Design a protein around this nucleic acid. Structure first.
Ligand code: NA
Ligand code: NA
Ligand SMILES: [Zn+2]
Ligand SMILES: [Zn+2]
Ligand SMILES: [Zn+2]
Length: 327
DNA sequence: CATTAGA
DNA sequence: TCTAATG
């Protein structure tokens, strides 16, 4: 957790590099498992050879460990850290819609900077356009103060459109959190579930609503169940306009909302942990359901859920406020 | 680990 | 269709 801190970090730097700059999925997959096990190793790694004993570490990584142990740095690391091409990719990549692939491609054509990007907006698609356009606000955190305002607005329209609608803003915001990255709104309706063959309009109506009043300004991606966009709080009585924020609305079959809602609220650890418990307690929990465990090794048959309560009950736990779903 | 774009 | 990107 810190005893092997640096080694795991150099290692991540490394893996991360293979993956983006070059396309060395293995090297890259290599670095990660190593960074996984040494992280676990309950002792201070004093030399490669020692590390070496590990499963995952080979002669390769051993080597790097030595040098780093030896001298407070890594050359390969110093070099990559320096090199502009690699720098550039790690940068373009920051743009919503720009991934490693397009990053390497733009680089190879010479688009290295954000300006370069502008001059060549034609080379960009719609997602990437929006990304470029809101680059700044996109890197910005969301004050909870703003979060509640937002939430307020979405909830009301959703309601006004159809009172049957059910929405939950999940995420950290849900878990109390002082700030959040983007707004995730979990959505489901009663006429929509597991079987009842869709009702795309069900998503589509609200999206339309939200745009109608300018809450939604842009559209990154709109499908029959997932809409990815950009929204914005009405810039008051001027002097101050609100930064553009990422927003995702998603359709859920009412018969699997809570699993979903439960799920998405996290924390990543609360999950796994909740997840690990359901196993002893003879179950299975995943993104959409909770199934009883069968001795034959496995089993199925989807437990009927009406709230986050039922789930706990099932695995017979204490209902944990989302506030305290921290781990 | 799954949904939407794209070309 | 595959492949990218975001989640
Ligand atoms: Na080994
Ligand atoms: Na990006
Ligand atoms: Zn020891
Ligand atoms: Zn989020
Ligand atoms: Zn999101």
């Amino acid at each position: 957790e810190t005893l092997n801190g640096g080694i795991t970090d150099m290692l991540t730097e490394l893996a991360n590099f293979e993956k983006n700059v070059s396309q060395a999925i293995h090297k890259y997959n290599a670095y990660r498992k190593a960074a996984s096990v040494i992280a676990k190793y309950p002792h201070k790694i004093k030399s490669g050879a020692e590390a070496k004993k590990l499963p995952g570490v080979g002669t390769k990584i051993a080597e790097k460990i030595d040098e780093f142990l030896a001298t407070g740095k890594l050359r390969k690391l110093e070099k990559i850290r320096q090199d502009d091409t690699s720098s550039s990719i790690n940068f373009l990549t920051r743009v919503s819609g720009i991934g490693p692939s397009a990053a390497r491609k733009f680089v190879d054509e010479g688009i290295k900077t954000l300006e370069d990007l502008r001059k060549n907006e034609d080379k960009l698609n719609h997602h990437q356009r929006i990304g470029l356009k809101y680059f700044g606000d996109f890197e910005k955190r969301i004050p909870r103060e703003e979060m509640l305002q937002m939430q307020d607005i979405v909830l009301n329209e959703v309601k006004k459109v159809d009172s049957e609608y059910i929405a939950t803003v999940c995420g950290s915001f849900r878990r109390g959190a002082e700030s959040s990255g983007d707004m995730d709104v979990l959505l489901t309706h009663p006429s929509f579930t597991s079987e009842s063959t869709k009702q795309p309009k069900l998503l589509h109506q609200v999206v339309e609503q939200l745009q109608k009043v300018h809450f939604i300004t842009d559209t990154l991606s709109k499908g029959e169940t997932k809409f990815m966009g950009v929204c914005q709080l009405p810039s008051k009585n001027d002097e101050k306009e609100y930064p553009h924020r990422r927003i995702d609305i998603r359709l859920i079959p009412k018969d699997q909302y809570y699993c979903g809602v439960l799920y998405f609220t996290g924390s990543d650890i609360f999950n796994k942990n909740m997840r690990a418990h359901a196993l002893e307690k003879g179950f299975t929990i995943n993104e959409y359901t909770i199934r009883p465990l069968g001795v034959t090794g496995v089993a199925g048959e989807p437990l009927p859920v009406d709230s986050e309560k039922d789930i706990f009950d099932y695995i017979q736990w204490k209902y944990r406020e989302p506030k305290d779903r921290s781990e």
